[PDB]
Automatic annotation (TrEMBL), chain B:
Protein name, as recorded: Ribosomal protein S17
Species classification: Eukaryota, Metamonada, Diplomonadida, Hexamitidae, Giardiinae
Secretion signal, residue range per the UniProt entry: none
Family annotation (PANTHER family): 40S RIBOSOMAL PROTEIN S17
Keywords from the UniProt entry: Ribonucleoprotein, Ribosomal protein
GO molecular function, one term: structural constituent of ribosome
GO biological process: translation
Annotated Gene3D superfamilies: Ribosomal protein S17e-like (1.10.60.20)
Cellular component, GO annotation: cytosolic small ribosomal subunit
Source organism of the structure: Giardia intestinalis (strain ATCC 50803 / WB clone C6) (Giardia lamblia)
Family: Belongs to the eukaryotic ribosomal protein eS17 family.
Pfam families, alphabetized: Ribosomal_S17e (PF00833)
TrEMBL record, chain C:
Source species, domain of life: Eukaryota
Designated name of the protein: Ribosomal protein S15A
NADP found in the keyword field: no
Record keywords: Ribonucleoprotein, Ribosomal protein
GO annotation, cellular component aspect: cytosolic small ribosomal subunit
From TrEMBL, chain F:
Family: Belongs to the universal ribosomal protein uS3 family.
Organism: Giardia intestinalis (strain ATCC 50803 / WB clone C6)
Stretches of the chain forming a coiled coil according to its record: none
The name this protein goes by in its record: 40S ribosomal protein S3
TrEMBL record, chain H:
A GO MF label: mRNA binding
Positions of region (Disordered): 86-101
GO cellular component labels: cytosolic small ribosomal subunit
Pfam families membership: Ribosomal_S26e
UniProt keyword annotations, A-Z: Metal-binding, Ribonucleoprotein, Ribosomal protein, Zinc
Family: Belongs to the eukaryotic ribosomal protein eS26 family.
Biological-process GO terms, alphabetical: translation
Disulfide-bonded cysteines: 22-25, 22-76, 25-73, 25-76, 73-76
Organism: Giardia intestinalis (strain ATCC 50803 / WB clone C6)
Entry-linked InterPro entries: Ribosomal_eS26, Ribosomal_eS26_sf
PANTHER family in alphabetical order: 40S RIBOSOMAL PROTEIN S26 (PTHR12538:SF0)
Binding annotation for Zn(2+) 1: 22
Name of the protein in question: 40S ribosomal protein S26
RNA sequence: GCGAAGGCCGGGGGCUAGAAGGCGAUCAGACACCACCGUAUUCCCGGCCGUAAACGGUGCCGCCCCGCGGCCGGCGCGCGCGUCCCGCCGGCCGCCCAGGGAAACCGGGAGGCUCCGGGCUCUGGGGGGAGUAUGGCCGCAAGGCUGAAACUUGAAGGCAUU
């Protein structure tokens, strides 16, 4: 399910991006 | 694999229809002479003639055994039935449906 | 819910005429409906009409001769200046010479030509061609 | 209202029909038997045969009228009608394209059509639409009237009804003309119309 | 070669029982032989139109097979227009087949008048709608000064129909001209079927002048 | 005649059809023409024009079919005209397949 | 009443005047091949003999496809007198 | 597009339906989609049934017949040839092939 | 306010199945499918979440609407009379004539609509970028809801035919 797997990669990047934002908050 | 082709079958069927009288049921050899007759058909080559006559033998045996190419020799009987009128007519000779119309057949 | 009773009526009238059925029945009787039918009788589009009373809405049976092409309503009733009954005929009627557009006017429910003679205009009730 | 015919029709079973009834044919049926068979009113059948005969008489060339029937039971009868009358015949299979293919071996342009069974003779009815042929149909109680000008309601299945109906039509067309006088009996016998 | 009637109508047509093409379209006659359209307008024949020669391909084991398809707008400026389509291996066979089809389906145009009446019908009688494929064309009556303002292709159909003035409105894939010309033709074909208030007096139906009852 | 007509710039379609007509006027049962080569394209194209029924194989064709090949030489280069004509009615030989039945007696 | 459209001077035009289908009073088109014409003869007092005058009607294919003609025929003829009105 | 108007499921006025299992796949399929055959067959092989019956000391003991229902998933059935891929016209027929055994 | 499943957070309970995790074959690799074992979970109770190919991929109320069949409930008519026959009303369905559509197909509508207007809400406007960035809110989280642009590109798509 490439659409499903693509939204899982987006969700992973969005988790890492929000976490990195928090380190520099 | 000896399946008589339409070319052999079409010619053979016409020959029985044209001259059912000339042909005989168990005789390929008589049929070959009738088929080879200059008047009956012009078959170029020996093989086609030999085969067409073989097909007439089977077809002739079949059209003598039963009406299996129309047979005028048998059409008269069919025509006799076509003109046949039973002398006593079976059908010339729900109950209240006639009473309903107004004229009562089998009144009462 | 049932809002424009005329639309119901005319749709059943056009549909019944399409299959040819000689008589069509309209469930609610209205002054505006009867007047559209009277205009249709005046131009001969409907053969005859009668209203059976139920002490309620009142029911209408319309005798159709078989000569009606289409009859429609315009919602909402748009106010038409006497100047604009020119433009409305062009987009809502088949040809300038034939076909009828009916507008409610203070003088009464009248055809486009009659209100063009009086040089007055009202709100469109609907159109019968 | 021929009393002599109705007794014969009662034996022939033209009064009876299939249990399914179409809305179009509802008018003709008087009622049903408890078992669900449907009783066509017999006088409607008479006022139908005569009505078809009046239409059929208008065709000045007799063979312009074309009869079709794939139903083996009625095959003798359509031919017998054609011999006693002078209509043309299309018996057995329809050889599709007869009406609209000009080079069809049997290509005809009839002015009238006689379809024995609306369902059994389905192709002919559609083709008659393409070439402006109005069509008369012998029909049952469950008969769709698609592309049928006039329909005669008979048992349209039993051999005795199917043959008798054609006999009634043939006698009626001739009686309207000359041939057999309106009052005297026909020399042709109803029985020879029915196939066995 | 000459002419031998393969059609009962054709036999009557050469026999001269029927005069004019209109009477055949009155009695709703199916027309199968092009010889009846040519014989009705023999002198100078009539104008035809080459439109949309096309090259359709049907794939087979070796590959696509190219067959040329052409559409023809046969018409003369009297109110008779026929559009027909023929597909054949060569362009020459296709144009001839389509021309034969276009002549076969010649249909009567009501033509008609705008508000002004003088004596020359110049426009379609009423707004006319036809849909072929995805395109719907609307043929609206126009004033005599205004000409045929339309797509270059449907303009010709309305000219080869003697309709000097028309208001056109085409919606859909008009670029698919084969469908576009069909919609104009379909609108024109059913112009007599639309009933105007003038056709409201019942008359005739006597059988005597019918071309179907006519036996030569 | 075809090689001359083609070399004289007569159009390919008409020219093959003129020959096709001559066999039909003569009554020959089937004529075909397969001009092939750089026919109006950088690549080679083959234009086969044919009218009527033509047998293709068997011993009969050797003694019942007429074949002729010419090489035309237009400005483009070599083109290959071909004509095949089949007549069942030629000299005193019958196509072997057709049995001839004509009368009741 | 001159059926047909007329120019201001007069001169009814409309060369093809279509036959109005009898049941629906709807004009029959040029290519209405399904549309048909049926004539029913007139019968004399003397043994229902044909008098050679027949009422005829035009019937559109659309009514025929529905099947409405079999009942329309009876109604039209009944009023004409042709059929036994009953 | 819609290959089947029933969408592959005899589900009408339901919203959700019970779940069942492919006998071999052990897949989970909605009850409506499941092939569902009912098979009644002899407990012993029919070839050996006569000899077993004669050997059966009991007078008039009929051989017991097993009664079971076999349900398979679409994928499972196509491989096991319980149902066959059919032409677009043949799909519309809903009657058992060659006339429950 | 309600909302499948999975998830969560406090309490239970715990067979089975079983994401993770471990193994055993396979294969070039297999760490995937197939076997074996097995935690979270599944089950309950109180909360949270707020999503599904949540689909019938078809908003809701209103009218007209062509016949033919089945099924469920209520009622009525008639007769041998039976859970019969025929309707009516509300559903659940199949097949379709018209009509419609680019078709597949809808036809109790996707009809009555280029001859376009019953009422009322929601959404869409070539393909990506991107459901991303950022801002708001909501959530315990997971995330939900809202939501770009710069820029890139001449195609993306539907249904049918071979």
């Amino acid at each position: 399910m490439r659409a499903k797997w693509a939204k899982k990669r987006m969700r992973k990047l969005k988790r890492k991006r929000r976490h990195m934002k928090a380190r520099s908050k | 694999g000896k399946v008589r082709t339409k070319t052999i079958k079409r010619a053979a069927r016409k020959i029985v229809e044209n001259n059912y009288e000339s042909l005989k049921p168990k005789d390929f050899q008589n049929n070959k002479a009738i088929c080879s007759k200059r008047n009956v058909a012009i078959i170029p080559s020996k093989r086609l003639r030999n085969k067409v006559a073989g097909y007439v033998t089977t077809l002739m045996n079949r059209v003598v055994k039963g009406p299996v190419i129309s047979l005028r020799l048998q059409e008269e009987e069919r025509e006799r039935r076509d003109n046949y009128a039973p002398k006593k007519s079976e059908f010339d000779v729900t109950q209240q449906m006639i009473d309903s119309i107004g004229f009562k057949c089998m009144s009462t | 819910v049932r809002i424009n009773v005329l639309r119901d009526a005319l749709k059943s009238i056009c549909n019944a005429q399409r299959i040819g059925k000689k008589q069509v029945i309209v469930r609610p009787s209205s002054k505006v409906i009867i007047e559209f039918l009277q205009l249709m009788q005046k131009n001969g589009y409907i053969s005859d009409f009668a209203v059976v009373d139920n002490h309620r809405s009142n029911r209408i049976v319309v005798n159709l001769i078989g000569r009606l092409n289409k009859a429609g309503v315009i919602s909402p009733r748009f106010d038409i200046p006497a100047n604009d009954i020119e433009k409305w005929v062009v987009n809502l009627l088949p040809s300038r010479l034939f076909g009828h557009i009916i507008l409610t006017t203070s003088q009464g429910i009248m055809d486009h030509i009659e209100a063009q003679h009086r040089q007055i205009g009202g709100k469109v009730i609907g159109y019968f061609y | 209202l021929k009393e002599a015919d109705v007794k014969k029709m009662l034996v022939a079973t033209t009064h009876l029909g299939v249990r399914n009834i179409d809305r179009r044919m509802q008018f003709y049926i008087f009622d049903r038997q408890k078992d669900g068979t449907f009783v066509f009113n017999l006088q409607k059948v008479w006022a139908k045969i005569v009505f078809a005969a009046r239409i059929l008489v208008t065709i000045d060339d007799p063979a312009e009228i074309a009869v079709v029937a794939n139903r083996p039971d009625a095959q003798r009868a359509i031919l017998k009608f054609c011999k006693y009358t002078h209509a043309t015949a299309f018996p057995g299979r329809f050889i599709p394209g007869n009406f609209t293919n000009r080079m069809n071996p049997n290509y005809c342009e009839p002015r009238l059509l006689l379809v024995n069974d609306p369902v059994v003779d389905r192709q002919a009815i559609l083709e008659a639409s393409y070439v402006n042929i109005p069509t008369i149909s012998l029909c049952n109680s469950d008969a769709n009237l698609k592309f049928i000008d006039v329909a005669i309601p008979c048992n349209n299945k039993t051999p005795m009804s199917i043959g008798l109906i054609y006999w009634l039509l043939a006698r009626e067309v001739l009686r309207l003309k000359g041939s057999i006088s309106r009052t005297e009996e026909w020399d042709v016998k109803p029985d020879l119309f029915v196939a066995l | 070669e000459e002419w031998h009637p393969s059609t009962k109508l054709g036999r009557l047509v050469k026999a001269g029982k029927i005069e004019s093409l209109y009477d055949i379209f009155k009695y709703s006659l199916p027309i199968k032989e092009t010889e009846i359209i040519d014989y009705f307008f023999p002198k100078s024949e009539l104008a035809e139109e080459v439109c949309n020669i096309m090259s359709v391909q049907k794939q087979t084991t070796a590959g696509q097979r190219t067959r040329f398809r052409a559409h023809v707008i046969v018409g003369n400026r009297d109110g008779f227009i026929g559009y027909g389509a023929g597909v054949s291996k060569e362009v020459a066979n296709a144009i001839k087949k389509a021309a034969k089809n276009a002549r076969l389906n010649i249909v009567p145009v009501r033509r008609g008048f705008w508000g002004g009446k003088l004596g020359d019908p110049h426009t379609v009688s009423s707004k006319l709608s036809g849909k072929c494929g995805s395109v719907r064309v609307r043929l609206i009556p126009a004033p005599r000064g205004a000409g045929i303002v339309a797509s270059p292709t449907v303009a010709k159909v309305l000219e080869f129909a003697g309709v000097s003035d028309v208001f056109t409105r085409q919606s859909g894939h008009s670029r698919t001209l084969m469908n576009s010309v069909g919609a104009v033709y379909n609108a024109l074909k059913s112009s007599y079927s639309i009933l105007t208030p003038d056709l409201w007096k019942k008359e005739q139906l006597d059988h005597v002048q019918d071309i179907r009852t006519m036996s030569l | 005649n075809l090689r001359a007509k083609l070399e004289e710039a007569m159009p390919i379609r008409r020219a093959a059809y003129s020959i096709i007509r001559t066999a039909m006027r003569a009554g020959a049962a089937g004529c075909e023409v397969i001009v092939a080569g750089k026919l109006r394209a950088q690549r080679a194209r083959a234009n086969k024009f044919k009218e009527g029924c033509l047998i293709s194989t068997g011993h009969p064709k050797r003694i019942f079919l007429a074949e002729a090949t010419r090489h035309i030489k237009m400005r483009q280069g070599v083109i290959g005209v071909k004509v095949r004509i089949y007549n069942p009615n030629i000299r005193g030989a019958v196509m072997p397949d057709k049995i001839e039945i004509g009368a009741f007696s | 009443d001159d059926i047909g459209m007329k120019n201001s001077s007069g001169v009814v035009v409309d060369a093809y005047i279509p036959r109005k289908c009898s049941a629906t009073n709807r004009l029959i088109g040029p290519k209405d091949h399904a549309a048909v014409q049926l004539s029913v003869a007139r019968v004399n007092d003397k043994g229902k003999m044909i008098e050679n005058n027949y009422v005829t009607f035009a019937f559109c294919g659309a009514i025929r496809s529905r099947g409405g003609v079999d009942s329309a025929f009876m109604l039209l003829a009944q009023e004409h007198g042709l059929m036994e009105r009953l | 597009p819609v290959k089947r108007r029933n969408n592959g499921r005899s589900k009408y006025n339901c919203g959700h339906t019970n779940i069942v299992r492919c006998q071999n796949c052990h897949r989970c399929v909605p009850k409506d989609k499941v092939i569902k055959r009912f098979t009644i067959r002899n407990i012993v092989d029919n070839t050996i049934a006569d000899d077993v019956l004669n050997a059966c000391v009991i007078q008039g003991f009929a051989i017991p017949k097993l009664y079971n229902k076999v349900q398979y998933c679409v994928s499972c059935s196509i491989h096991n040839h319980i149902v066959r891929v059919r032409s677009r016209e043949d799909r519309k027929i809903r009657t058992p092939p060659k006339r429950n055994s």
